[PDB]
Amino acid sequence: AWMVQRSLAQEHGIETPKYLADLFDYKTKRFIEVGITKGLADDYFWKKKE
Amino acid sequence: YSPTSPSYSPTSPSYSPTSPS
Amino acid sequence: AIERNLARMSPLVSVTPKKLTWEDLRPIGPHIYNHELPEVPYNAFLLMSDELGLANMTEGKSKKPKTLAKECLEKYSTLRDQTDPILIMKSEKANENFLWKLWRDCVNTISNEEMSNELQKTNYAKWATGDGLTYQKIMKEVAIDDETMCQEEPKIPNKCRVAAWVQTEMNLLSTLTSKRALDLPEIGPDVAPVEHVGSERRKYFVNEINYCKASTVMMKYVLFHTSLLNESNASMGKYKVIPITNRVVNEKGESFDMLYGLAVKGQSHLRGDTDVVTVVTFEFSSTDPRVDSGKWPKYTVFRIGSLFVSGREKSVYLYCRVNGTNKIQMKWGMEARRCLLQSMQQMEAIVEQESSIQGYDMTKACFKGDRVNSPKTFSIGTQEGKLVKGSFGKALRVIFTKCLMHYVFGNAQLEGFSAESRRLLLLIQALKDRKGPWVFDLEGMYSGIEECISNNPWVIQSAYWFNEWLGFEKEGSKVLESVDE
Amino acid sequence: MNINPYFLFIDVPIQAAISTTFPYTGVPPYSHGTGTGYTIDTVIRTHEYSNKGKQYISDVTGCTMVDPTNGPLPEDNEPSAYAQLDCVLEALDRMDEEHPGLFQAASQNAMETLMVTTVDKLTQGRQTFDWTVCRNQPAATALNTTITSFRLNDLNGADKGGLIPFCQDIIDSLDRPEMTFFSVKNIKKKLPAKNRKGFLIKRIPMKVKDKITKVEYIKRALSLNTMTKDAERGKLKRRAIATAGIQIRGFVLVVENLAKNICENLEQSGLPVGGNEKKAKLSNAVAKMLSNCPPGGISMTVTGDNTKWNECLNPRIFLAMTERITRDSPIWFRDFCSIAPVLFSNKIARLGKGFMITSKTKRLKAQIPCPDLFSIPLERYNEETRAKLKKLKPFFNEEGTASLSPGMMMGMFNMLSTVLGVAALGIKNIGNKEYLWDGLQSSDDFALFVNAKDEETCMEGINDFYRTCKLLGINMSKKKSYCNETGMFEFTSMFYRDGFVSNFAMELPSFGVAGVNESADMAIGMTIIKNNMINNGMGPATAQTAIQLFIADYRYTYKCHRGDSKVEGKRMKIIKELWENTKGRDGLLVADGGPNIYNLRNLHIPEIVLKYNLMDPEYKGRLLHPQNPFVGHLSIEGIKEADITPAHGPVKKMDYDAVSGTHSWRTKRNRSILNTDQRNMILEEQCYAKCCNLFEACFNSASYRKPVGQHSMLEAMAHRLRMDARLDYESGRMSKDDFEKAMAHLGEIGYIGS
Amino acid sequence: MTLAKIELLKQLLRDNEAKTVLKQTTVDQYNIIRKFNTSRIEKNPSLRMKWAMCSNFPLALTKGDMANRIPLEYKGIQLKTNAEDIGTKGQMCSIAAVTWWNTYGPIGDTEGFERVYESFFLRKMRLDNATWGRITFGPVERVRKRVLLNPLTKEMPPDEASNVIMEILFPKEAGIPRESTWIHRELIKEKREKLKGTMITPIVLAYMLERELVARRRFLPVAGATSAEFIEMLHCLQGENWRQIYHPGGNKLTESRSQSMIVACRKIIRRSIVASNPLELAVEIANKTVIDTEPLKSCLAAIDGGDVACDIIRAALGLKIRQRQRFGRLELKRISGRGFKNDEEILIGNGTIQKIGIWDGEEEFHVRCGECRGILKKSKMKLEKLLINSAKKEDMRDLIILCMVFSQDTRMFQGVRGEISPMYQLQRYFLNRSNDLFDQWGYEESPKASELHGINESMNASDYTLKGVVVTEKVSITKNLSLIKRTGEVIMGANDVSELESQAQLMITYDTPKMWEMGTTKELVQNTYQWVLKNLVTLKAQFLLGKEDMFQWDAFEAFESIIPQKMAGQYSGFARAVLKQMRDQEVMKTDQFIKLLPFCFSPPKLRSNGEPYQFLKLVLKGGGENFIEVRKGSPLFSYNPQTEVLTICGRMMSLKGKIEDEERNRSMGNAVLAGFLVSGKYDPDLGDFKTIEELEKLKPGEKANILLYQGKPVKVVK
RNA sequence: AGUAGUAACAAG
Lengths: 50, 21, 485, 754, 718
What we know:
Radius of gyration of chain B: 14 Å
Pfam families (chain E): Flu_PB2_1st (PF20947), Flu_PB2_2nd (PF20948), Flu_PB2_3rd (PF20949), Flu_PB2_4th (PF20950), Flu_PB2_5th (PF00604), Flu_PB2_6th (PF20951), Flu_PB2_7th (PF20952)
Shape of chain B: rod-shaped
Number of helices of chain E: 27
Subcellular location (chain E): Host mitochondrion; Virion; Host nucleus
GO molecular function (chain E): RNA binding; RNA-directed RNA polymerase activity
Largest interface: D-E, 170 and 135 residues
Distance between the termini of chain B: 38 Å
Subunit structure (chain E): Influenza RNA polymerase is composed of three subunits: PB1, PB2 and PA. Interacts (via N-terminus) with PB1 (via C-terminus). Interacts with nucleoprotein NP (via N-terminus).
Strand order of the largest sheet of chain E: 11-12-15-16-17-20
Structural class of chain E: alpha+beta
Number of strands of chain E: 32
Strand content of chain E: 15-25%
Largest sheet of chain E: 6 strands, mixed
Shape of chain E: globular
Distance between the termini of chain E: 100 Å
Radius of gyration of chain E: 35 Å
Main location (chain E): host cell
Number of strands of chain B: 0
Oligomer: part of a larger assembly
Structural class of chain B: little secondary structure
Helix content of chain E: 25-40%
């Protein structure tokens, strides 16, 4: 997981995120974090945005 | 001098006797 | 619990303290004075003080061992050509004929126009080398069913007495000669004053040893084992004639190739490190074996001729002996130069201490003296029962020889003896220091020493020397028992 | 005038000339043939010191077990194994008082280290007994053959990575009704030969699968391999030594780690401290006891030696030590620490090759293996063996092994046995008598300092110490121990006389050519000189002569004499050409027939670095060729580490500084056994090597940092190369065709791995 | 590269054995199979090499294109194994093959070599740019200390260093990002550029990076030069019996100069203090002392730090005194007040009793921490005021804890949880974990003034701030080395200088024939007694003529400096008495004369009743072995009448020809107690051997039993 | 024979 993340980040000249990403979009060239919450999406969004 | 030469050792403290004359 | 058990434990469980006195220190191995026992025979791989090298000027080069031996034998043609020798001495189980034939085969091979130093596996070579002497390995089932097949009783090292020659060796090997054999390579040039100090010291320390008889004997052992180990690996299947040689340098710096004799390397399929290869040594000597016959029971000695040595015809004998070695002994032989370091370190430490006191390098002062300081002397030996003092160089030359003897006569007997007698040495020191030493089982301590005194010429002589020195230490102690009374 | 070398001691104190008493230019003693004679001696003696204890039959192995612990107190001064649990516990309680929280601290650190410890840690051991081939192999080999064989019996705890789940499989394997394992068996092919017997037996070893029963396996897992110790110094007679299996190593590691933590914080432990740190510690301890001496009283030092140390020490006592040390620990960790002593309590000694019977008349010899030791009447053995085998009978097992419940033949508890020794030192006094004792303890070696009013009262303290030790199963040698007023003593071959004196002879054999390679050996050789100048009182004159001697030895060993020498040789022929072809000959290494430029001041500078600026750029280019074929796959250990063998002690690894070049080579593996075809064993070696090299091709860090993961090597290699490929194609390093080929190949690999 | 690896994996997976290994072996288990070895292990490597070098093809060849560039033979010499000999063993080569490669082989790229092996090349330039002073022959007291073997580029913990090397060599495999990457960003960047474009194996790069980042510390015998740059030349610096002056090349740290500065100043004061006019001698020595190559005066003037000793020497040399203290990451400069340290066994809140130093008196300090500048005010075991300027969270977090740790507040000592110089250990404890110490303090109100504000544990502004938070020199020196203000207030004294004897990081030299007077106890003892032995003839003659001027011979002043200030005078009283007694009663003992003469220098101190103090042993400074025995031999001084040898600190000197014949039979009992002489032999009726106490509480005329040493009891009369 | 020394090698 980390080898992939560090290969991708180093290839596309982007900062290696301190945490382990869930997906990487090759078109956008950005790491993605997926979230499954049993409450409010906006609550989970801003709590993981911090 | 040369290390093996006795004069290579520095002049040591020497007790010289005292006399008022 | 501890005090409970300690209370009920028997008084028979005791550490039996005994305050040591000089009187308690009886001589070690008193059997070495028993004249019923055989005097310990010479058992070294090569001759030492009794060596004779046939000298031949080197034309600068380091030519082939076969070539340099050939060229040396050509100059002493009379000794080389002798075919009618007088048998002087015969070893109990030695075949004189077979040995002489093997010597002639060696001389004839080394002197021939071929580059090969291989001997044909003749009936005499086969006998000398121990051809086909290993027992056949049969199947365990056959052996179990065979009633006559028993586990053999082990051979035990025989109990011997003091031999006068072991003293003679020490005396003559620690003596100065006109020749230098050391092959010391170059070091980088000196920059640091301490580097200059070491180099100026080496001129005293290295030259003292280099000129002494022991150094030349050491180099012969070193160079022979070096060639023998290479021959043993390179020519496992072949019987090979190997010269016993040395490159010696006189006072003017002239080089001479010495030929001490020829050796026959037998078959050498040396798989294990302890596996034996038979080496048959044919070494020249001026020494008549009849003068001290107790030294020479392992040797078959021919008289091969004569040399004019100092306005006198001196007789030349050929000492022949079936010997053996393994890979380990050869490798330690190849490393025997380190005898220099053990002796040099011990004596340089005294110079460094002496320099600490005076404030300048006391090397020259210790050796030869200077305008301020008298030459440093040491108790060196005994003459007509009286204690004789000798020089710093002599003391260096004694330790160096002693350290060569540790290699030449090194084994489990010397290992055990040196380790166990060291306790006694330190106890004696405690009495000398007036530090009131106590022992727990003195007679058990002597047992561990004395079980190591058997047939090792160096152990037996070391035991003799220990007792001699102990006697003089006991006499000295009488000066201390009067102090503050 | 007759020279007497002992007359030196008239002018120089024995300690001041102690080096001259070590004959370390001599050949150290080697054993020939069998060690069965010596091993059987150990089995008999070990049982002689415990025979008055409880004797019973193991209901696990059927072995004859002897328990001297809590046995009857001895009534003589012979070696006693009758250690009293109470006294051991009282000794450990008095340590716990003097070091509050040490036992729990040590237990915590050891436990936390274990929770972090991975299985690969077990590869750092030396020679290990491999139960699968009933021979000694390297630790890493024995571990692998155990892990792979364990897979055949549904034991995959090793795959988790941590030591604990592997150790769980080891104890769980003892419950398996049958054990299938990978063994080795050789095919015999009778060929002709030019010898008396007329023929030859060419063996071809091949990997097989073998099945053994639970009891048979338990016996193998509890078994020690025995051989004779070679090249041991200061001893007339040889002794048996033992090697343990891989199973117990994980448990021993933790128990020794526990004991190390305790030992580190004990003021009187000479372990695990070593060299200059030990000397300082001992020197401080001597200065303390000297100053803390009662005025008008006397201080005395026992130069202490223990006898039958391993023979008399008892696993059951160590089991108690682990129990009392791990008092406030989780039950799992207390249970973990309990296993190594328990496996030792039920250990079985393998008796070696057996005895050789011969006919001097018929010139025949035969090896009688241990199973068949009693297949012949004992009248056909010599008096010594006939006596041994008669005393062995009760402890002898049908399959040629011996039961050995008491004693510690393998050793391996050096720290825990030191903790036990320091416990005795810790008592200090008995019955409020007018004396105090203290000391230093390094395994079986001890110095005891005793303070009192007179030496008579000091002797009472020494006698009380002597007796106290017997209660812990420790036997002070009365033959080899001696006492004197404080100022001089000997401890682990270090000699004190108003301070520790130099003992140069001890280090002498280490000055030789190490036998790693001509590059490493040059660094090692110069470093040994450098270090002996610092530590062992080697003066500048001797140091410089050492440089000469080393170069002489080096040149003859590696057949690399000076290019301007007229020395014959195959290498020398090319050296002579290199000498002529080279302009800057100062730049040539000694190994290339170059001059020696090493002196005292530059001993610490790698030879290539010293000569670099003096080198010809063609020579320098060849010497340091980045893709040279002499340097193989280098490990971080490969470049820095080298096993150096001292005269006295265990074989330790030392660091050296050398530039990697064409002289940094490696000798072919010892696959040179007479009338043996190793083709199967070599292929196995090459298979693992291929897999590991290709893994290092994908993961370049593997050589440096230990790779982590419980997933397959292939899964890791595939994922890496898939990303490599994609990002090589999307960057334009790889062509569209190559990408399609790569992804097609990866598709086949993806299928093979699932 | 990538395709080649994938193609090679497919070829490898064709082998069903390899397929099994790759599938079954976990990434963890790579580390096990990497070391797999079924070959019989070599027990004698030194022998095996001497053996193998005599064989035809002992070396292993790496299969490749470069191996093939080596011919089968050269001018008859077989270089590598024949193609018909390869198979189920591999291709081997002779040692001659290596020689052939170094003679006629391919010439490879060596670009970056010097940058890869920078560590080793600096080691060489340090030697090449070095200067060598004199070698001198005299006693060297070496101490075994844990020292750094080699200088480092930037020292790190191994785990930290490991990560930095991963970022430099193998970034894709570096794993979880670490904060160290940002800290060492300028190192990484620099190393990447140096190790760009080199073809040398990355494992070699990794090792050589590990060499200059991971430290190697060992116990070695040292003598006043502890810095790695000296340690790497330690073999040439000294033995037990000689010293070699060595100035290494390259630049040295200021912290190394500062540490040596302090050691030098402490040594000058310790020798000066014992002189009549310490200030005169202090100035004489200080002027002629050099720290490596820099004069002491230059270092003191250049470095803004040190201790009491440094300031005292500064005042003596006419330099402005600094009152700078460095408490790890806190830098203080005295504003007002004076503090004295009193080591007392204070009970600490974890559950142990540690001997910590209580600083008495009310002091004000000029504290500083990067951005933070403040004025502190501490009393005995308390903090009263602390006026600090506004700065970053990180810069304030340090200063606020550091101020409350250095003040040694009683709340801090009673707030320790877990197993921990003892004071500096508390700094590194409460810096890592701070949420333990703030709970064991208490909070108070914040001031609502114009400039005043308060902060809490969350590193931000709050009303629950810590208790006491408030956020917004022409000196003279006496003969006795006391620093006095114009008002008469002494602000520093000789008695304020640390007693701690430590090893200088840089080699200190004294450009004076008096340099020997700056020796350690064992050095001074050895030299002093050597001076006595060198002048024994005149010294002994003059003493027997009735003169006692030798008692106060300059040569003995240095010796006095290593006698504890308490006992020096009392020892002299005893020594002079015992000496006078020996000549006055014609009971002379030359060994005892030599032993005690140096102790006669100090101004004598006699008992209240006017008789001298009696002594069993004379204790000198340093370890427990540093004492002289009056009756007995000691580690420092022992005489053997058997061989007339005098051992001083291991060195043996002959007294042959310096001993009176009638002296050898003379008992030492006459020269052991002041105002006592040998009456006769041991008298059991007089009871046990009398103690020094009982011997001092004896009325003149009475007899007593004395034990000189084991087995020498003597009856003595007063 | 010899090496060696409590048991081997003197080819397998």
